[PDB]
Design an enzyme around this catalytic site. Structure first.
Site, PDB file in Angstrom:
ATOM      1  N   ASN A  67     -10.023   0.146  -2.534  1.00  0.00           N
ATOM      2  CA  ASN A  67      -8.716   0.123  -2.160  1.00  0.00           C
ATOM      3  C   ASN A  67      -7.686  -0.609  -3.400  1.00  0.00           C
ATOM      4  O   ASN A  67      -8.319  -1.663  -4.065  1.00  0.00           O
ATOM      5  CB  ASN A  67      -7.923  -0.543  -1.052  1.00  0.00           C
ATOM      6  CG  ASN A  67      -6.652  -0.015  -0.622  1.00  0.00           C
ATOM      7  OD1 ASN A  67      -5.622  -0.477  -1.076  1.00  0.00           O
ATOM      8  ND2 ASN A  67      -6.678   1.280  -0.284  1.00  0.00           N
TER       9      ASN A  67
ATOM     10  N   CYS B  91       0.522  -1.368  -0.095  1.00  0.00           N
ATOM     11  CA  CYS B  91       0.126   0.054  -0.037  1.00  0.00           C
ATOM     12  C   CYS B  91       0.729   1.286  -0.037  1.00  0.00           C
ATOM     13  O   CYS B  91       0.334   2.187  -0.554  1.00  0.00           O
ATOM     14  CB  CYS B  91      -1.175  -0.087   0.933  1.00  0.00           C
ATOM     15  SG  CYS B  91      -2.412  -1.111   0.395  1.00  0.00           S
TER      16      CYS B  91
ATOM     17  N   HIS C  71      -3.794   7.577   1.032  1.00  0.00           N
ATOM     18  CA  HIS C  71      -4.035   6.198   0.367  1.00  0.00           C
ATOM     19  C   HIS C  71      -5.528   6.100   0.739  1.00  0.00           C
ATOM     20  O   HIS C  71      -6.204   6.447   1.863  1.00  0.00           O
ATOM     21  CB  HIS C  71      -3.029   5.534   0.844  1.00  0.00           C
ATOM     22  CG  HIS C  71      -3.451   3.880   1.217  1.00  0.00           C
ATOM     23  ND1 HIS C  71      -3.893   3.204   0.302  1.00  0.00           N
ATOM     24  CD2 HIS C  71      -3.253   3.241   2.418  1.00  0.00           C
ATOM     25  CE1 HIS C  71      -4.164   1.733   0.996  1.00  0.00           C
ATOM     26  NE2 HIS C  71      -3.922   1.997   2.285  1.00  0.00           N
TER      27      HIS C  71
HETATM   28  C1  LIG Z   1      -2.037  -2.315   1.210  1.00  0.00           C
HETATM   29  O1  LIG Z   1      -0.949  -2.439   1.713  1.00  0.00           O
HETATM   30  N1  LIG Z   1      -2.832  -3.496   1.138  1.00  0.00           N
HETATM   31  C2  LIG Z   1      -4.244  -3.258   0.585  1.00  0.00           C
HETATM   32  N2  LIG Z   1      -5.215  -2.685   1.668  1.00  0.00           N
HETATM   33  C3  LIG Z   1      -5.519  -3.153   2.592  1.00  0.00           C
HETATM   34  O2  LIG Z   1      -5.384  -4.423   2.779  1.00  0.00           O
HETATM   35  C4  LIG Z   1      -6.458  -2.674   3.564  1.00  0.00           C
HETATM   36  C5  LIG Z   1      -6.993  -1.521   3.355  1.00  0.00           C
HETATM   37  C6  LIG Z   1      -7.600  -0.795   4.497  1.00  0.00           C
HETATM   38  C7  LIG Z   1      -8.006  -1.447   5.651  1.00  0.00           C
HETATM   39 CL1  LIG Z   1      -9.278  -0.752   6.709  1.00  0.00          CL
HETATM   40  C8  LIG Z   1      -7.539  -2.810   5.819  1.00  0.00           C
HETATM   41  C9  LIG Z   1      -6.691  -3.502   4.892  1.00  0.00           C
HETATM   42  C10 LIG Z   1      -2.476  -5.016   1.364  1.00  0.00           C
HETATM   43  C11 LIG Z   1      -1.367  -5.544   0.522  1.00  0.00           C
HETATM   44  C12 LIG Z   1      -0.936  -4.639  -0.490  1.00  0.00           C
HETATM   45  C13 LIG Z   1      -2.099  -5.645  -1.106  1.00  0.00           C
END
Ligand SMILES: *C(=O)N(CNC(=O)c1ccc(Cl)cc1)CC1CC1
Ligand SMILES: *C(=O)N(CNC(=O)c1ccc(Cl)cc1)CC1CC1
Lengths: 313, 313
Positions: free
Chosen positions: A268, A112, A238
């Site tokens: 996301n 992320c 983000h």
């Molecule tokens: C980002 O690092 N990512 C994707 N995002 C999430 O899993 C996430 C966003 C928001 C919330 Cl509340 C929880 C989880 C995970 C790995 C890159 C894919």
């Protein structure tokens, strides 16, 4: 040296999935998903369209926006957690498809937070004097690693790519300040299951960590630029959760009309998240040359990054 | 600013696999494997020992050798094509297990060439004046991605890790010259097959590329460093094929006893290959302070790297 964004582009794939779509396979509702996340739709790549294809679409737009030629690119860095393959990398495939010279190309993994990690990486290179036009991509096809049997995650995630050329910009513009970090103690809260190949999350712990780190990293990166809340034109977090984004905005002290929100249309998109938000604000005429913007993100790792950027060549 | 190797460590796992091991399930012999590769044995990690465990052991040795404390490390970069997971990263897991502050950590993919890629990445960060002690790991568990039903590749690959601390070194030491490149047109000659999860190779095309790039690139960085054949104390190519290594060696016009040979005991270990050869030369007393060493390598991508380094802190 002034090192900034010489060009920008973003791409989400064609297929748009609404909240109501999930009701035929899962015990979810529009009302539930909307309330909890702020997501209304997300974009999903087609079965024959991988991360590299999304990356390609964003990069060609970045190069046109930069007014350079492929042969000007002197390094490719792709931030992705979902590269087609570990070798060759999305970065390698772009060297071929973009028709650049035979320049250094690599994928960088910080989940992320990858797009911010890669832009900062590119900055270090440009500051040496040896690099002039570095293509930085943030691309994830999260649809590949989504457990479509889990209502709690199946609704969260979509696909897309962003890209910037990092190079010299005019006086006072570009990357003013950044913050990067990680905390592996949080790895167990957000990981790729080795057996299923699917994203696994302790939602409540990811939430609590996201609220704090997003708040911390954004205020810290403003202090390091010797700016306050009042100097910021756009806050571009983000895009994952409207509540998390709200909490971060409140900590930072900037007004709601100053926060970019695109989670409603993309869900996301991990490394693509901030760029897809930037694209929205460019086209809506909310982001212009000499605006000061704050980016912040957290990721599986756990990772985080934040930057203060003054917009323009 | 002189940026170089403040500290060095390496680790191959305990389990040794001899050439004769393969005979019970493949049509191979010692002489067949030995004539082809120059390989006699390789090390494979246990089923409960992943790329992070290999990386952890090389990293602690690197820290003790640098005579620093975990709290001094200001960045972790892991070069791997076989990280435990895409998130959290091997770098993330090291952030926790090494007991460092909450510093930037990321995995970088340039396959075989990754270790060289990542030391160069570390150098850019140190030259900026903001980073002083960057941990750089080359770690691959290739055992995990080896097709044990294909005699061509089953015998080629083993497991290991190397680690350096990249920071400031005394007058004239450290990284003198480097080159890093990629050619995505070669992606189809060496890749991770999506369906099997195993390394697929067009051996002929790879050997032809290896020969050409490992000679062109070593020669160029020797030139770029304003040095010649006689200035080279150690030649340390990526260890994989003894006929490919000899080709690079004679193109540099260098004595046999000046090249590092460890492919005999490790096979090819991707990002770990050069560090495992460096460690053998150190403990055998063939590598000393102010020795000028030449690194060269290629990887899936295709990628390549070459550097000139003057040893010591
Ligand atoms: C980002 O690092 N990512 C994707 N995002 C999430 O899993 C996430 C966003 C928001 C919330 Cl509340 C929880 C989880 C995970 C790995 C890159 C894919
Ligand atoms: C390195 O990139 N690497 C290790 N693999 C090889 O396929 C190889 C090395 C040397 C020769 Cl002569 C042939 C093949 C491949 C992928 C990172 C694992």
């Amino acid at each position: 040296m002034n090192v900034g964004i010489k060009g920008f582009g973003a791409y989400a794939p064609e297929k748009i999935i609404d909240n109501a779509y999930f009701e035929q396979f899962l015990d979810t509702s529009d009302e539930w998903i909307s309330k909890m996340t702020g997501i209304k739709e997300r974009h999903w790549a087609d079965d024959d369209q991988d991360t590299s294809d999304l990356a390609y679409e964003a990069s060609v737009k970045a190069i046109a926006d930069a007014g350079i030629q492929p042969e000007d690119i002197d390094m490719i860095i792709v931030a992705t957690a979902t590269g087609d393959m570990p070798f060759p990398t999305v970065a390698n495939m772009l060297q071929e498809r973009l028709g650049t010279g035979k320049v250094a190309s690599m994928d960088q993994l910080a989940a992320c937070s990858g797009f911010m990690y890669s832009m900062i990486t590119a900055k270090q290179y440009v500051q040496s004097g040896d690099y002039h036009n570095i293509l930085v991509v943030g691309a994830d096809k999260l649809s590949k690693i989504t457990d479509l049997t889990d209502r709690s995650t199946a609704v969260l995630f979509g696909d897309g790519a962003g890209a910037v050329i990092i190079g010299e910009v005019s006086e006072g513009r570009g990357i003013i300040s950044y913050e990067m970090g990680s905390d592996g103690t949080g790895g167990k809260h957000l990981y790729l299951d080795k057996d299923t190949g699917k994203l696994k999350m302790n939602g409540r712990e990811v939430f609590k960590f996201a609220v704090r780190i997003m708040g911390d990293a954004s205020t810290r990166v403003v202090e390091k630029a010797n700016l306050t809340s009042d100097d910021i034109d756009l806050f571009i977090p983000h895009q994952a959760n409207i509540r998390i984004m709200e909490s971060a905005r409140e900590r930072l002290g900037i007004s709601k009309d100053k926060m970019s929100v695109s989670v409603n249309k993309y869900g996301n998109t991990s490394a693509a998240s901030i760029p897809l938000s930037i694209d929205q604000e460019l086209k809506n005429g909310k982001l212009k040359d000499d605006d000061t913007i704050v980016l912040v993100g957290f990721g599986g790792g756990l990772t985080w990054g934040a930057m203060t950027i003054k917009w323009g060549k």
